[PDB]
């Protein structure tokens, strides 16, 4: 779930990703 590009950290998809 952790993005290589830091500008992703607060994206809809990363947040959804953490909602395993």
């Amino acid at each position: 779930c952790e993005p290589a590009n830091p500008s992703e950290k607060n994206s809809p998809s990363t947040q959804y990703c953490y909602s395993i």
Partner: antibody, heavy 121, light 107 residues
Framework: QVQLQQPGAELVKPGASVKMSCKAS????????MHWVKQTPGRGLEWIGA????????SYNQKFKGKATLTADKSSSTAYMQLSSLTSEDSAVYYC??????????????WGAGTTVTVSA | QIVLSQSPAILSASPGEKVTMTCRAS?????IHWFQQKPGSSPKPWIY???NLASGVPVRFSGSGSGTSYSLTISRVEAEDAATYYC?????????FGGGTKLEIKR
């Protein structure tokens, strides 16, 4: 002229630390992720980490997590990578590269000329 | 980190020949990237998103592939093509590069 400027070379004493610069121009520095890549003849091109200048947010490769520290300065539009307690294995070429377009997928479309580091006493 | 294996290590090509180089990944990736690197210089974006050509990259170059198997191919080898070509992936963090296939001109 979208460009990334890095010093040509740095000589570091084994044990010391070195902070490398990577000045950017021709685009707004705070809307793109800056990446750093390591290169040696033996271990190839290795991704170290990245930083987003508009946030300060950083991302690391586990391999260089305790070796590199990434920072960015808004006013001078410069990215920095500090290498701590350098050993012979750190002698290599270091690149900074901007990434863009998450769409299809990311793209390293702007690279720096690379700063060659030699660690020797 | 996904492992990208390139082949051949060295590819000898006569001027005018049509050659191809492959790239295989330890596990599936959505797109593969190619960079050209002449010695002493920084690697140059050559192909992005599997099949697209970067700015100033001649039509002789092309790329395709899927899942774990990709390839870069030159339709007409020219002198200025000598260099190492590198494979690259963004599907997994940390993003990784391949070992590179060195192309040399058999003139």
């Amino acid at each position: 002229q979208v460009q990334l400027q890095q010093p040509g070379a740095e000589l570091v004493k084994p044990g010391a630390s070195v902070k490398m610069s990577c000045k950017a121009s021709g685009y707004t520095f705070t809307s793109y992720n800056m990446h750093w890549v390591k290169q040696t003849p033996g271990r190839g091109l290795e991704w170290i980490g990245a930083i987003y200048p508009g946030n300060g947010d950083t991302s690391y490769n586990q391999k260089f997590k305790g070796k590199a520290t990434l920072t960015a300065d808004k006013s001078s539009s410069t990215a920095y990578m500090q290498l701590s307690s350098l050993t012979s294995e750190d002698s290599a070429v270091y690149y900074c590269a901007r990434s863009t377009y998450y769409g299809g997928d990311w793209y390293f479309n702007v690279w720096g000329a690379g700063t060659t580091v030699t660690v020797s006493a | 980190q996904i492992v990208l294996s390139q082949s051949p290590a060295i590819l000898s090509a006569s001027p005018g020949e049509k050659v191809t180089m492959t790239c295989r990944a330890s596990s599936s990736v959505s797109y593969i990237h190619w960079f050209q690197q002449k010695p002493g210089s920084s690697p140059k974006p050559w192909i992005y998103a599997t099949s697209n050509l970067a700015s100033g990259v001649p039509v002789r170059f092309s790329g395709s592939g899927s899942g774990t198997s990709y390839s870069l191919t030159i339709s007409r080898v020219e002198a200025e093509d000598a260099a190492t070509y590198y494979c690259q992936q963004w599907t997994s963090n940390p993003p990784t590069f391949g070992g590179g296939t060195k192309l040399e001109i058999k003139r």
